[PDB]
Amino acid sequence: GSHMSNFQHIGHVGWDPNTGFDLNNLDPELKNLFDMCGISEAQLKDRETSKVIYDFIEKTGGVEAVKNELRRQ
């Protein structure tokens, strides 16, 4: 089995499956969460590790979703 090709709520960031997150395009509000967890830039440059991390962003509805979720009270 596999996921459906909707791609309607994806997170805009410099992530690629070949090298992971681009530090030059990493959002500073999305970084709030990464740092609260204790994640290093080395984990963000691992393909397999950053593939797990990025899944959480597109899952809530991309970067604008996490940027709002931590803004709740």
Partner 1 sequence: GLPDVAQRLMQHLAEHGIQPARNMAEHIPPAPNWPAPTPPVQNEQSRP
Q: Which residues bind partner 1 (CB under 8 A)?
A: 32-34, 36-40, 42-43, 49, 52-53, 55-56, 59, 66, 69-70, 72-73
Q: How far is the CB of 72 from partner 1 (least distance, A)?
A: 8
Name residues whose C-beta falls within 8 Å of residue 30's C-beta, 6 or more positions apart in sequence: 13, 57, 63, 66, 67
Nearer of residues 5 and 73 to partner 1, judged by Cβ? 73
d(CA 35, CA 13): 17
Q: How far is the CB of 19 from partner 1 (least distance, A)?
A: 18
